[PDB]
Amino acid sequence: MALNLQDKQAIVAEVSEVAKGALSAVVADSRGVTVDKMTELRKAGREAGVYMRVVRNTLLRRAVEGTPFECLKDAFVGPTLIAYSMEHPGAAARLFKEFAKANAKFEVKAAAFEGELIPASQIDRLATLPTYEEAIARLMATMKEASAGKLVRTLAAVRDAKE
Amino acid sequence: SITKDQIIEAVAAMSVMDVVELISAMEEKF
Amino acid sequence: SITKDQIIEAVAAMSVMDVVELISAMEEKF
Amino acid sequence: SITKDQIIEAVAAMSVMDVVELISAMEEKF
């Protein structure tokens, strides 16, 4: 390894991943396998890429004090063990899902998904931007408007009505 | 057409006809 | 009156109209 | 961008034109 220089390197780099980054995912790893790297980086074969990195930098006073790059409310995002996930390129889309449906396979622990930056806030796992390039989902979000919402309710009765 | 016309018809339109109508309109699209 | 010819010829009820119709069908049934 | 009440009031395009605005929003696809 090395000294405070190596530190500064690791931090300025990994938090540059939080400066120019597309998204952020904070995950506590206990019983974290090699099949984990063989999960996120296998999903990096045909879907993701080298555009993704997850380092365990929960070294904290390194990776936290190392955010003059302005990650706030993150002291609370520093408890216990955490594996930082940052995306420089691509959409912020799929990565959140990769972990979301990783940990539910029991896949280590999710830290209850403590939440991370670009909302810049606390813990809840939302559906915001898995759904893009899915815009067929919007093709069905129109719900046909005048037609399918009509064949749901305006024609509901004749099947549900005679009684 | 005025909404009240479509509503009046599709509401009344008998029964013996109507259940073979609106159901068929559920058998065309969706 | 007619059923399928006025359904195929309607195919309109602009969603202002359509949704309104729905609501006013909630003023009669359901 | 952001012509809201108007782009949505365009629903006077009825149902079939809507089927179009869906079709072209995908087509030359799967």
Place this chain on the structure above:
Amino acid sequence: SITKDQIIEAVAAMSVMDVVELISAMEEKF
């Protein structure tokens, strides 16, 4: 208004703008 342009101003646009339109679209009608 022409449907073609209405689609052109939609398809290749950016996704946040899309979502903000979807949620407000879940309100107006239906």
Place this chain on the structure above:
Amino acid sequence: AKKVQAYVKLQVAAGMANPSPPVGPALGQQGVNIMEFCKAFNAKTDSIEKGLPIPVVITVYADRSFTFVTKTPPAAVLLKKAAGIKSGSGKPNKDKVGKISRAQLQEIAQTKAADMTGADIEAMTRSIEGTARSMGLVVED
């Protein structure tokens, strides 16, 4: 995948499938059947080609025969069919024997898209590079 249940890899070439003399009772003794090794293999093998070594995982629990999921051959034995000499190492570093290049072995690296460790299609080249260097072959890049 979990950790281990059973598996083995021992063979020579797909050219002759299920050989008696090279392995025989040694192809396996588990609950793997020596005569039954000739079916589920040749099913896919004869469905593509023969002559290339094909190792594989042998999954056995309690039930009769075994189930084996095949992936890719060794990249070291690809120096026999298209590289150069029929053999191998020989006198590997005592002289420059064979020489391959950047051009060759490229599509050889491309053939396994489910078998690599890399997200980097540029990186996954220098893995097979050494596989060409095990016998002491010089590379012209």
